[PDB]
Amino acid sequence: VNLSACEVAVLDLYEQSNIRIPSDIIEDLVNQRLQSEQEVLNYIETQRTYWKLENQKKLYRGSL
Amino acid sequence: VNLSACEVAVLDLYEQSNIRIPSDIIEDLVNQRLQSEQEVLNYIETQRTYWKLENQKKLYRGSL
Prior knowledge:
Radius of gyration of chain A: 14 Å
Largest sheet of chain A: none
Oligomer: homodimer
Shape of chain A: elongated
CATH architecture of chain A: Orthogonal Bundle
């Protein structure tokens, strides 16, 4: 997207720890117009925590 | 995106179980050109399992 400058360095860390970041988190991050690196990381991380939980939810199905 | 017909129904189930589906999973799903409902669901689910795991990975940082 239209990516910032330190954001890009935090993203490069995850890439270096073989973590794939969900593009959903990319979106919400650019909208935060955060100024740091510590700020960025703490934010992606909150989001990973979040997305870990959402993928855990148990689905209700008229299926099986 | 260019969305299918039964896919859309499985997507509607998750929406009905207040599960937000990562758009990454939407992408990979359309590329599967899967024909069912059972097929679709079993696929999204494998993907949720996967994404739950990726968001769990522990990051390595020159930060803290």
